Design a protein around this ligand. Structure first.
Ligand code: NA
Length: 422
């Protein structure tokens, strides 16, 4: 479907190298885990404690409880995996996708149908990113910041493909299997009916972020203004202007209209060009696994449910950290790593998601970390004043850590910053 352009061919290759990296990465992928099934009354979650564990068990309980009996057989060939999965899953009634899932890899026997189901989920979760289908693009170099392609309607079946992707992701959650497609935290936020934020723009589009901030920083008029409640987009040529409001072309932007402007424009940047595609994703998801079942999860917990946890090697982490104005030996940095040393693995993941915008770690670990601009190690900067919380720049894998005056000040601030939502 994709027109044979300069970007398309660049993207084609980059995705092919993913395929050459695919085999090795699945051994790494096999070490992802969550929690052993609840051993209670029909896997009852127990009494509510705010933990991720409880939410996991609670959500599994609903899956178990609502699952149709018997089983369903998805029959696919290793080399036509996308097309075969798509045909099978989209000709089933969505309720039948909640029955126990048997993946039959054509001509491959061997048992450990769990093994096989896990591999299929992993491989299918990369296969959907094939540039050929026009569904996705990245915002940075490499595979940085996956987003729906606004020119996806190049593929005339693109909405039905988004529906299948929705079903497949729900089936991952529904059967406790991990995927690796690489959706962003704001994309999870949309699955939770949560409104993405100005801070979130920094993750997906730092340039666009830096300006929206320099609108709200700057007083207006002083240094010009000259804006309407409109924004342009360029979907496959057609420089389509888009009203921020109804009759927006006339609706002219003042200083009085500026916080409204920012809210509408924040909202615009996340939704622009990808509305029908996201709707089709959500409808596919929702017919297999009700989105209402996600109600306890924040976007980071949702990510972790889908991707699975991995153990964080402290040594690798600490080894591949770089500093700005701090050294390794600085007082605040000593306290930082002490707090990290005392965290359990799940809070270590929480901090990783806070600083980098994902729970996922590249195959080499911390030395291989990508920011927007390409390689970018985990970085701690001496920035802020004491009464500030720590802040991150996910674009740069960067934590701004105020020069706090004690371990307990730092500890409480950092724990607070990482546990916050919206
Ligand atoms: Na096969």
């Amino acid at each position: 479907w994709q027109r044979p352009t300069a970007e398309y061919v660049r993207n084609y290759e980059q995705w092919q190298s993913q395929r050459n990296q695919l085999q090795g990465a699945m051994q790494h992928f096999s070490q992802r885990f969550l929690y052993q099934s609840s051993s209670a009354s029909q896997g009852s979650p127990g009494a509510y404690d705010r933990s991720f564990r409880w939410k996991y068990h609670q959500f599994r309980f609903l899956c178990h409880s609502n699952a149709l009996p018997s089983h369903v057989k998805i029959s696919v060939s290793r080399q036509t995996l996308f097309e075969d999965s798509f045909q099978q899953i989209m000709n089933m009634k969505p309720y039948d996708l909640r029955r126990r899932l048997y993946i039959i890899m054509r001509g491959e026997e061997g048992l450990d149908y769990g093994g096989i189901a896990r591999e299929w989920f992993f491989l299918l979760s990369h296969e959907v990113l094939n540039p050929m289908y026009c569904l996705f693009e990245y915002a940075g170099k490499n595979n940085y910041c996956l987003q729906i392609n606004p020119a996806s309607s190049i593929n005339p079946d693109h909405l039905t493909y988004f529906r299948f992707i929705g079903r497949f992701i729900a089936m991952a959650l529904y059967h406790g299997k991990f995927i690796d497609t690489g959706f962003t935290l704001p994309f999870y936020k949309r699955m939770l009916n949560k409104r993405p934020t100005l801070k979130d723009l920094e993750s997906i589009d730092p340039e666009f972020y830096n300006s929206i901030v320099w609108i709200k920083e700057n007083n207006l008029e002083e240094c010009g203004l000259e804006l309407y409640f409109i924004q342009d987009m360029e979907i496959l040529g057609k420089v389509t202007t888009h009203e921020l409001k109804e009759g927006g072309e006339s609706i002219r932007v003042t200083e009085e209209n500026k916080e409204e402007y920012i809210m509408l424009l924040t909202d615009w940047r996340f939704t622009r060009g990808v509305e029908e595609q996201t709707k089709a994703f959500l409808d596919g998801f929702n017919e297999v696994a009700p989105l209402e079942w996600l109600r306890y999860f924040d976007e980071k917990e949702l990510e972790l449910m889908l991707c699975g946890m991995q153990e964080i090697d402290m040594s690798d982490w600490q080894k591949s950290t770089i500093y700005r104005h701090y050294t390794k030996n600085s007082k605040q940095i000593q306290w930082f790593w002490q707090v990290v040393k005392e965290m359990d693995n799940e809070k270590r993941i929480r901090l990783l998601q806070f600083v980098t915008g994902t729970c996922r770690l590249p195959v080499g670990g911390f030395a291989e970390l990508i920011g927007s601009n390409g390689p970018q190690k985990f970085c701690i900067d001496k920035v802020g004043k004491e009464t500030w919380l720590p802040r991150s720049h996910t674009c740069f894998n960067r934590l701004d850590l105020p020069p706090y005056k004690s371990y307990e000040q730092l500890r409480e601030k950092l724990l607070y910053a990482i546990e916050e939502t919206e």
